[PDB]
Amino acid sequence: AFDDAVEERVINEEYKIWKKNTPFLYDLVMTHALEWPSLTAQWLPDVTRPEGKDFSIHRLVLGTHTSDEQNHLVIASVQLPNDDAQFDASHYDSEKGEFGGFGSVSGKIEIEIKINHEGEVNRARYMPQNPCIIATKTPSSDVLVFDYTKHPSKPDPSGECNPDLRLRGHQKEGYGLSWNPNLSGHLLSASDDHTICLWDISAVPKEGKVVDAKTIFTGHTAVVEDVSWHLLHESLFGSVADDQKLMIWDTRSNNTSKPSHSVDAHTAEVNCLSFNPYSEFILATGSADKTVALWDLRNLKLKLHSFESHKDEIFQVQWSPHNETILASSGTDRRLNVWDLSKIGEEQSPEDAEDGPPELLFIHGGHTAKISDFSWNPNEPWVICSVSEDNIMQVWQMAENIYND
């Protein structure tokens, strides 16, 4: 009806005005249209710095969401200018009064590796101990594990994929997936089957192809939306489910049906969680309340704070790897919110409070659809890649004067 047309017109006008205002708010904007929408996006730890060049090359792991076509797990390359090259007195525009000029310097985005994948790539996450190993979530009950160095750079002529490992623990599809950063080969997956599955692929023989579930946790009574290992403890891991619950599990606990700790995190479905890389006690959970709750592991009864500037459901929350006080959250409201922890509870001018709470730092509204997934760049600070539903991938970085000042 008229709802779709009005929404499309408003979104187009908002994107136009955002593009017009982009120079004041960003130091880097790279809009790219992918072949198919990507439900997942993750920065690879590889950064290749070719000597004698003014740029570095980063890599991204993405998926494809085809309604009736062949689905692909994609590894793509992005070129980003070097910091020393960001100061260059090449040309001086005497009219606009800037050292600008569009010129020919541009970011190069290209697809490097495409691998077949049966079904949509719900979420792909590489193993930190070995970036060659990538685990993918399918719309089936199995979780796939690929090694992109053991597959051709171009897809097979036909047929489905040939996964290196197949993990069969669930009964339904899922979206939560996380490797253990302290125990190599330990993988945690969450699905709609109300269970969390833990696999240990560190003892697979050379000719092995199927791995059964090492452990199954059945504490949650609803769809387990996300699961994530603790970044410093090889035993503790958190999970957020549709039952408005966040559970902290210990693998040393013999009870696989009751978590070591349970918290009524929110008033609706909690879709994501992430641990702070610099503090072993602090984590964050994004909910359907349009809220992000801050949790201290030393005091789980009290919610540390609630970030409340989102306008719809929140699906991904990730911490900044270069700053403990910086948080990011994306959702269906076509916005990516960046928050500063050190600005919580500060006084605010009457017109500044109109924009939002003092903890809110930045708003990214360059996406015309739901932001499927975003990821911080672990090598270049303040660089975020976000992929949305309308096959749009954007690698961007906000202006230096916003965070540095």
Partner: protein, 380 residues
């Protein structure tokens, strides 16, 4: 970090004796000054290219010196360039508004009063006082504004091969060829501390085994350039010897302000003897600390410095025991002087073979700079 060794001789393949960056720069591009045996003081423009490799642009040549120029030092404001050489006269240069010069420099003051070659020069924090060491066994303190000598220290018994000025304005440290470190009180204008000998444990039969801290004439470097910490807390003196076992080991001694007659520690440099020490002027936030009594000094910030021996450069910081950097075998002869850039992104090293080199650091590679530089508790 990256190392860029220059393949083109700056002073017609003659030895390069000194280097110093323009401390007054506040941007990304820096000004460097080099002294050589070719009786020329050359000023260059140093900046990083798009790839990150240092690029050197020639700016000016200063040929007023008649003999070899041994020491070149910039004022704290970077406005006056002090050059000392074998002619026993110190020239103070300034920019004024000669075919090869992109920019022109002229002598403002000719400091006279030395009798032999000048080897080291140190400025005061306020920039109105200067200190210079010479071969004539005297260290002379000059009034920069008046352009005349104000004090002479003749307590040395050999060549004076290093002088540093306390950033807090209380002491002046001199290192001489007589294996003696001297600390002069800036107010009394006399000798405050003498540091020559050092004991090492108990003997074998309880005797007080005491040797000499510093190197003998066997040193291959003209210079013994010690340095104060930018905050002033510590004093680093190169060309030291420690009798660990039956054999001596080269080291750089580290003294505290609390007692200047005994060093806190020594950084050992096996192989050749250390000759230069230069500190990075950037105060860095502390690294994620593994709790140990390893730090040289316990303060909320830390400071990175470099110790240059005959054939190597060791990069230390405040809190770590082991150096975080080590470079060696980049020059075929003895190194002469090292100098940090204003932003800490450059470390220029000069060697007597005629070629210089740069050590470059990426953004925040050395550490996270403090939001506000700490205020100094000056004595004066």
């Amino acid at each position: 970090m990256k190392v860029i060794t220059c393949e083109i001789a700056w002073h017609n393949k003659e030895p390069v004796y000194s280097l110093d960056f323009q401390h007054g720069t506040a941007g990304r591009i820096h000004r460097l000054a080099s002294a050589g045996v070719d009786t020329n003081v050359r000023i260059w423009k140093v900046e990083k290219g798009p790839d990150g490799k240092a690029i050197v642009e020639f700016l000016s040549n200063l040929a007023r010196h008649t003999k070899a120029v041994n020491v070149v030092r910039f004022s704290p404001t970077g406005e006056i360039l002090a050059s000392g050489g074998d002619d026993a006269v110190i020239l103070l240069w300034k920019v004024n508004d000669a075919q090869l010069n992109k920019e022109n420099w002229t002598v403002v003051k000719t400091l006279r009063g030395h009798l032999e070659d000048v080897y080291d020069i140190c400025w005061a924090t306020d920039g109105n006082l200067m200190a210079s060491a010479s071969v004539d066994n005297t260290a002379i303190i000059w009034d920069v504004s008046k352009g005349q000598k104000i004090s002479i220290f003749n307590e040395h018994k050999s060549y004076v091969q290093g002088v540093t000025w306390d950033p807090l304005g209380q002491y002046v440290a001199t290192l001489s060829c007589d294996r003696v470190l001297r600390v002069y009180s800036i107010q009394k204008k006399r000798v405050a501390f003498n540091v020559s000998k050092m004991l090492s444990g108990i003997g074998a039969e309880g005797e007080a085994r005491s040797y000499r801290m510093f190197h003998d004439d066997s040193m291959k470097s003209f210079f013994r350039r010690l340095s104060f910490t930018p905050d002033g807390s510590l004093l680093l003196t190169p060309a030291g010897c420690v009798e660990s076992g039956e054999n001596v080991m080269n080291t750089t001694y580290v003294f505290s302000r609390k007692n200047l007659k005994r060093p806190i520690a020594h950084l050992p440099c096996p192989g050749k003897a250390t000759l230069a020490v230069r500190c990075c002027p950037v105060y860095f936030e502390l690294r994620p600390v593994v709790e140990t009594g390893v730090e040289l000094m316990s303060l909320p910030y830390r400071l990175v410095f470099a110790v240059a021996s005959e054939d190597s450069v060791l990069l230390y910081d405040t809190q770590q025991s082991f150096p975080f950097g080590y470079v060696s075998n980049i020059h075929y002869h003895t190194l002469s002087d090292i100098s940090w850039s204003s932003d800490g992104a450059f470390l220029a090293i000069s060697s007597t073979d005629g070629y210089c080199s740069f050590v470059t650091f990426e953004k925040d590679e050395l550490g996270i700079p403090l939001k506000e530089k700490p205020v100094l508790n000056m004595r004066t």
